[PDB]
A paper describes a structure:
The RBD of SARS-CoV-2 is the immuno-dominant region of the virus spike protein and the target for neutralising antibodies generated either by vaccination or infection. We report four nanobodies (C5, H3, C1, F2) engineered as homotrimers with pmolar affinity for the receptor binding domain (RBD) of the SARS-CoV-2 spike protein. Crystal structures show C5 and H3 overlap the ACE2 epitope, whilst C1 and F2 bind to a different epitope.
Author numbering:
A (entry chain A): 292 to 621, 640 to 676
B (entry chain C): 14 to 69, 77 to 144, 153 to 179, 185 to 246, 256 to 291
C (entry chain C): 971 to 1067
D (entry chain B): 971 to 1018
E (entry chain F), F (entry chain G): 1 to 121
The structure:
Amino acid sequence: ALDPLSETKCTLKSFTVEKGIYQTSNFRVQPTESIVRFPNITNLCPFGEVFNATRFASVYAWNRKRISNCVADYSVLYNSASFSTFKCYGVSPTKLNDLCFTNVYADSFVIRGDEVRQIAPGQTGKIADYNYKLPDDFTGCVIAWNSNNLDSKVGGNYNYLYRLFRKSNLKPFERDISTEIYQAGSTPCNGVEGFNCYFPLQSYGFQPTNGVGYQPYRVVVLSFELLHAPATVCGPKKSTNLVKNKCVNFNFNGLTGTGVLTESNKKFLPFQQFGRDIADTTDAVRDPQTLEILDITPCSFGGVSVITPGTNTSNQVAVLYQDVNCTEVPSNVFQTRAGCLIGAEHVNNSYECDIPIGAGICASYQT
Amino acid sequence: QCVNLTTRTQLPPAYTNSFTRGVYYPDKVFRSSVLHSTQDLFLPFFSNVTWFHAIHKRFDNPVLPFNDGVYFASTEKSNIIRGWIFGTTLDSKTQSLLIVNNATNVVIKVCEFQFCNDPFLGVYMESEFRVYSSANNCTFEYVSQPFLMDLNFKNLREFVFKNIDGYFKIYSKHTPINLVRDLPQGFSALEPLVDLPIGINITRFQTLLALHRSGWTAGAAAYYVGYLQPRTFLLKYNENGTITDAVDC
Amino acid sequence: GAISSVLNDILSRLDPPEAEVQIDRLITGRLQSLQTYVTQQLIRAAEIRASANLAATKMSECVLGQSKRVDFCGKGYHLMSFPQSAPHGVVFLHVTY
Amino acid sequence: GAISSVLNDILSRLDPPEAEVQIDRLITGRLQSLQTYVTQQLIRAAEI
Amino acid sequence: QVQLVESGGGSVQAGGSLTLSCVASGVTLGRHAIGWFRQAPGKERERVSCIRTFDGITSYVESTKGRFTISSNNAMNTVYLQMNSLKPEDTAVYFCALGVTAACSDNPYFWGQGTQVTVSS
Amino acid sequence: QVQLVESGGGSVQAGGSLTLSCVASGVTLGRHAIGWFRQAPGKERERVSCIRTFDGITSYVESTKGRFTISSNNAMNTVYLQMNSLKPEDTAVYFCALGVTAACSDNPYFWGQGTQVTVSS
Ligand SMILES: *[C@@H]1O[C@H](CO)[C@@H](O[C@@H]2O[C@H](CO)[C@@H](O)[C@H](O)[C@H]2NC(C)=O)[C@H](O)[C@H]1NC(C)=O
Ligand SMILES: *[C@@H]1O[C@H](CO)[C@@H](O)[C@H](O)[C@H]1NC(C)=O
Ligand SMILES: *[C@@H]1O[C@H](CO)[C@@H](O)[C@H](O)[C@H]1NC(C)=O
Ligand SMILES: *[C@@H]1O[C@H](CO)[C@@H](O)[C@H](O)[C@H]1NC(C)=O
Ligand SMILES: *[C@@H]1O[C@H](CO)[C@@H](O)[C@H](O)[C@H]1NC(C)=O
Ligand SMILES: *[C@@H]1O[C@H](CO)[C@@H](O)[C@H](O)[C@H]1NC(C)=O
Ligand SMILES: *[C@@H]1O[C@H](CO)[C@@H](O)[C@H](O)[C@H]1NC(C)=O
Ligand SMILES: *[C@@H]1O[C@H](CO)[C@@H](O)[C@H](O)[C@H]1NC(C)=O
Ligand SMILES: *[C@@H]1O[C@H](CO)[C@@H](O)[C@H](O)[C@H]1NC(C)=O
Ligand SMILES: *[C@@H]1O[C@H](CO)[C@@H](O)[C@H](O)[C@H]1NC(C)=O
Ligand SMILES: *[C@@H]1O[C@H](CO)[C@@H](O)[C@H](O)[C@H]1NC(C)=O
């Protein structure tokens, strides 16, 4: 890491370097700063309403609340020690604040302990199979806490129900509240009750003094919807002032990228939010704060070549930053069509090619 | 005042050709001078689209099935087609969706409606709102600018309704037409209008019309219904962001 | 086989122990894609080198001389040839009798 | 590395979540075999 | 098929306490009304108590009110009958009784073996 | 926030035994001194007992020594007060008391609802 000649020696794994041009590393322009453009929505998400509502629903009839168009703080939930289970699948529990979700679905109910692990994708069991199902590709956080402090009234609380019998396995994210009498086999129910005509509906009857496994549990399942829809459930991160014509790290409604943001002549249709190239790379973005179209140009990069005569001849080297303007590069500096050449003196005279640099340009050790 | 109206002189269903019509911007991504291949629910090219008539006493407003998607194209001059109804049962036993256009207003209500056998609206002006007896125990609601507006049949109005995982998505387009008989042999891309997070088991479709005042008359209103299919399309985004052409693979 | 094709959307959404598996899947796929590209380019480079060797031989034997080789320098009895540059190639105007 | 070389004997014996891993193993192996075949055929085509 | 395995009872002083446990297999408590019946010597079938496992409501008779407490823990598939303040008139064989209906009023169709409870004056 | 859910107590004969349970939520036992206070009729606030969950040491008063036993199981977040050898002077409402200090001497700031203990002569 001392000088370009040492980079050449380490690249070749040789203490002696022959005359020629050698690519040793890759110049990359680094981002000066990170800029954030989230939508200014001060309205807090109703996590307060869903986490300590007066009454939660039964598992067989799980209550779904749609969360959208609000700033969401998952840090306050993670910091609270009340929750016993905070299992996040497809997302990181710490990273939840930075993410922007197109939708959120909070599913609130009450279950027992022995089936807390039933609510997780690819699980089986009575509550898992006939009460609440999670798809294998489910993305979101299951948050369970013990609340027998206000769950089980003395003498048994039979308010919350569960469906222990059903015709078929519940479909993922599907609710079945039907109380049609189930025919288990030989004897047809004919729509009436009797022997082997097991009714789907069953009752908990939590006692305040049951085993911890048998005790009530309040569970909220947050499902994060991350389609190509616009991201509306964003974190509380402060939006920063927009910076143009400078290689920056940017965040536009959950689209993160490193690039130079320039004023775009592209005139998006009013519903359009992003732009893409023939290769489906992000080409243009729309500022959330002001309806401005911005071209995203990737930060200047390219190979670094070392023009050297043999270490027999000299330790002097020139450096070619390939396809880089002589402004991005951090005493002769000469702009060629092959890139920026530093440490080589431009000479008007034409000679036979010695070290081929690029588009008609060659280098040599002389005088 | 829920009423029964029956004088229609019914006829076996008419059919029409959809000459490369019913394409929409599949996503919110801007693209310029690119041929992009999309696997999505499109109205197949050159497919049968059912032709319902509202012409004087002939009225066609049957409760159509709502498959994977619907393309509703109304050619009109007297602004008769005002609204749509979605649901599984439409008897208030199951959640139902209602979209009605008022002068410079839209109403999109998701309620359990005790719908009529023949829901409609009445104009003498804008006299009757005889759709549902009861609109009980309502849920998600929306108001915005009117979907269809003025600015032979002078205007053709294309709509695409897709009820997908969590969103009822409406795409719309308004086109000046000199032709009065049937759909143009042209190309039009349907820009997205709304994405309502409704989440209903929609399989059961109905149209809302306005009657001019038994003792009724409809006036010229010709609307086409064409169901969507999962198809692969090749869309030609021109250099200024518009889908100027498409290929049904 | 990863959760997302975007690498930056994995690191932002996952902890290093869990992001590691998805990044390994992406690395395997992209490495195989790059290896395929490089192998096809080596074969295509062999084809272009054969074509360029033929072009150099035609320049030597056809422009810098008169060739007795039949059909090496086009229809008929070769009189002379004139080279013209073309985008990534050469064009020989063969004057024959 | 799959439980069976026969693809149809995997789908018949396993649920999609578990059949997915074995089918991925078979896909990786057969894709590598086909890539090897195509590369050797490109080199042999250059020779011919 | 359904089994009603019983336990507890035996001999006890008049005014003492006992606990009867009934565990159900092949069925789950949560809707089916489960209760306790008894046979005193020279007496027919009579209800002692019942609990609706669908709602947890308990029904007794004049002879068992207050002295006997019925309690269903549907989670362990268990029903308990606690005798307190026993009398020699309570010397009876107790049957665990189950229905295919939510109502305790409906006659049980589903019987356990029986446990003898003897009360000594 | 912290809840102190209490259970047990009720009516009992003079010289009998009872058990009071207090379970803490939003806090964990292990350092905070948790104890029992009571209100007798026409009497002010007085300490019954305390246990230092940091060390398990127990403190009583003259009126409760030996007869009452306090015991903290910090692992279930539970504290138990066992009355033995009760007297009609012990008819009182008992409050579960918690601190933000390790010392039982420090006045508790953290109160439970209360359970009535009645002792019949
Ligand atoms: C939407 O409603 C339809 C009924 O209008 C449901 O279709 C029924 O599905 C069950 C099995 O799931 C069948 O036994 C019935 O025969 C179907 N009914 C009809 C009329 O075909 C459909 O399941 C509902 N969608 C969801 C997600 O529950
Ligand atoms: C309970 O509701 C209150 C009311 O806003 C809220 O401040 C608090 O965070 C909620 N508690 C939990 C554990 O979510
Ligand atoms: C954010 O603020 C700008 C002006 O400061 C305003 O135009 C815009 O409407 C605001 N965003 C929203 C979502 O209202
Ligand atoms: C290169 O340097 C070495 C020093 O070890 C010297 O012996 C050799 O003669 C040199 N060769 C030339 C061509 O200058
Ligand atoms: C380098 O940048 C300057 C302005 O920053 C511009 O005038 C010039 O044309 C650029 N040259 C190249 C080769 O990019
Ligand atoms: C070459 O000569 C011209 C004069 O014609 C001069 O402008 C230019 O600077 C010279 N180049 C160098 C590298 O000295
Ligand atoms: C008349 O309207 C009532 C409204 O409830 C409906 O039940 C009935 O079927 C209708 N009659 C006919 C012939 O459509
Ligand atoms: C379909 O279209 C053809 C015209 O090409 C017509 O003859 C036929 O009746 C139509 N059938 C249906 C079911 O739409
Ligand atoms: C007309 O617009 C109003 C908004 O002021 C709306 O409440 C109403 O539903 C619309 N339609 C009718 C038929 O009044
Ligand atoms: C309206 O929906 C609610 C669901 O909370 C239901 O309880 C009520 O019975 C419904 N209305 C009628 C008339 O059934
Ligand atoms: C380009 O945009 C302009 C509007 O500024 C429009 O007139 C023109 O039709 C667009 N180009 C094409 C090919 O449609």
